[PDB]
Assembly symmetry: D2
Homo-oligomer: 249 residues x 4
């Protein structure tokens, strides 16, 4: 097999390359994410969750990702630098994987998002008027700094900061939530990911996973794509969720 090792910082990389060599895996090193990562049997990401999001932005078909967490919280990672070798051995030898859905947005045709699509004001400290439609029916209209359409994996990201619920990773859904809504009452809405979401706003920008962005005016449609994020199986993902969330800062 051949693996790609993607690292934001140079630390721990020689060690990981050595461990992979013991597993009879050929290694190629990447200091930046690349679409060439599609040509590998699996990917080892060294960094936090953002490294993983930036890797995913290069992949349509996704080789399974193994994350070694040097960042902050590491909801998408599998191991720490202090003990990754055993978990990596398990992952390569069993080769069991999990798939989580990614969403596409009509404003950025070739871009996929694991966490969220956010619609924001082009100008900080100015609001936009956002209308939300789900399966063709207008369900809300609200003045806000922006509006988030997150997956369940994104429930612990931007949506969390905006006041959203923590949703377990195996419950497929969208979380629909405004950022700084100028209204007396508002609630996050949690809907089936099989539904079509439309967000309508003028003078806005759309951002996927905090990485890629574009101006738009009028309507954008957001729907589940055919190209999920693929990770090695983390048997502790549900258990670890609650502790990791409490450490978010």
């Amino acid at each position: 097999m051949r693996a790609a090792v993607v690292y934001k910082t140079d630390g721990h990389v020689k060690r990981i390359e050595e461990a992979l060599k013991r597993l009879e895996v050929e290694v190629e090193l990447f200091n930046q994410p690349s679409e060439e990562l599609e040509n590998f049997d699996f990917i080892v990401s060294v960094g936090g969750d953002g490294t993983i999001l930036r890797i995913l932005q290069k992949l349509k078909r996704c080789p399974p990702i193994f994350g070694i967490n040097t960042g902050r919280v590491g909801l998408l990672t599998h191991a720490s630098p202090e003990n990754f070798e055993v978990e990596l051995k398990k992952a390569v030898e069993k080769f069991e994987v999990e798939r989580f859905p990614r969403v596409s947005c009509s404003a950025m045709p070739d871009v996929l998002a694991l966490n969220e699509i956010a619609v924001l004001s082009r100008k900080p400290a100015k609001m936009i008027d956002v209308a939300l439609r789900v399966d063709g029916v207008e369900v809300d209209r609200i003045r806000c700094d922006g509006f988030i359409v997150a997956t369940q994996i994104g429930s612990t990201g931007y949506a969390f900061s905006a006041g959203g619920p923590v949703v377990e990773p195996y419950l497929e859904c969208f979380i629909l939530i405004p950022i700084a809504p100028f209204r007396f009452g508002w609630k996050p809405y949690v809907v089936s990911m099989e539904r079509k979401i439309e967000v309508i706003a003028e003078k806005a920008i759309v951002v996927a996973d905090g990485q890629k962005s574009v101006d738009f005016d009028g309507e954008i449609t957001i729907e589940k794509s055919e190209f999920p994020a693929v990770f090695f199986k983390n048997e502790k993902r549900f258990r670890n969720l609650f502790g990791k969330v409490r450490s978010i800062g």
Copy 2:
């Protein structure tokens, strides 16, 4: 067919009975629900959502319920008194139903809940220490006035008041949320309804759907039951959710 008409107040009853008589349905009137309601082909509830919850408290096997809303919000009802005949005719003639899961609780055998099981302090204005386990793993411990385990149908009830998300009726899940938690940070958790929930607390009471209560100490288990709530299909349930929620008060 034979239908039971169950009413909180006697207003509108005679006209609903005459409407059923015109549909060639035999009618029996009930001023309070009873277990006898299982013997009918369908049930027409005249009242708000609480009337429906009280009807369900008496039903294991559930004949389809049609709700005529004389209450405040009416998330579980199908029509208003001003225009119910057309919708009632459609309901009886098509006889299409929807089933929503109910949960059971180990402290109260033979009691089912559509909205929530809530564990509260026995002493008002006094907190209880609550531990929460999901599929056998302790995921949180928190001091609070009480703790709610809600279905998605219950997301617009007690869980809503406690600060929970609005969840669409066709996404099956539990919402796990504290009432007045004494902690710097906390979040609602949304998990699969296939999971087993355990709530552990001393000096508490457990309440199903705001209707039935028992004192308990120690552990209670909450799980999906085999006996759902059955309603005639409301083709506008999803569309109506958003406007109805905004009117909550």
Copy 3:
């Protein structure tokens, strides 16, 4: 001088008694608070914040209180058991004090509260309809589990749990906030403590500082009293607030 030492647990008391004798202060020991505490030059509380609230419940005229924290967070305390001697000596030799307003409630004439007056449903898991008036004008009506009228000192107590803001101890105000409000929109209100607050509710109970309660129906009036809680000056009160708050749980 003579000091009362009030303790919830038996443990650290002999140590505190010896420290006071070295400061030439006669000591009397109390396992429970009583009205006799008014007859002392000052009071040393050994416990958490609840022990201080229970002391205050017995005091109209309030000798200065010095708190030694054996409870959880201790916003009302001055020192810990591990190092209290130097702070106690400074407190007594300087005898500088701080006064924090307490409020009274028309339902319980001789009862005073430092944190809050709370109006709650007499029936567990059932809402009450609460109307709120400030300086004679009805400002809100809401269905809720209860309603809190807190001082700024109470902003880190029940009001905090209900979702209220943290208000610094030297900004005199009321925080008005519902517990589990069944409404799409609601906000905590912060008003001058010179204003008269009226809460109107049927089938309710009123509770002062989580300690003393009575059933009531109709209108209660809540206002600032002439008998503040008196503490030795804590020079680090403002500074310590933020760290202590982050530790609540």
Copy 4:
């Protein structure tokens, strides 16, 4: 006297000018705010609250402002276009005024704010790391979209949208609150307006009342200024607050 009439829209201006003429007031019309407005006895603003904020940005010494609300909620206005002549007459004849403090920030000397100073990320969807100091002590560090330092008048503006409390206009304080904080726990802080606020952030912009803005890096200080906003007395300001807030959208 001489009055300036400032108008966002040109609709009711002729009506207002003729009314001032009846009160023997010399009128000068302004299509937009100018520092020349300082040279009038009073100012009549035709528009919503934003028009008033833009007028104030051009004023150090503030002639009393009378607001005619063509906007949406109009917390700073005194009358609607349908009935302004009676309230305007009372204002000119009694000439009773109210002063509300404005704040300055060190990044923009000579710029004053009535609602808030907000520190925001320069890039949408990108967080900044913000440290907050009050009277010289660091009281929080948080990753967020931005951070708001509001006056009590600003409690119904950006701070409101960010989840802050509603504070009555006659209780002077700062409300310190993050916008979309990436942390498990957070609270708004309400502190005395006598305190000095320092916000520290890199790659940020500071914005006064949603109008004037500048890039900054490092530290900014925010303090109460000597130049309040001056309005004609609105006898119903406290009473109207609660209804106006509930209509915010």
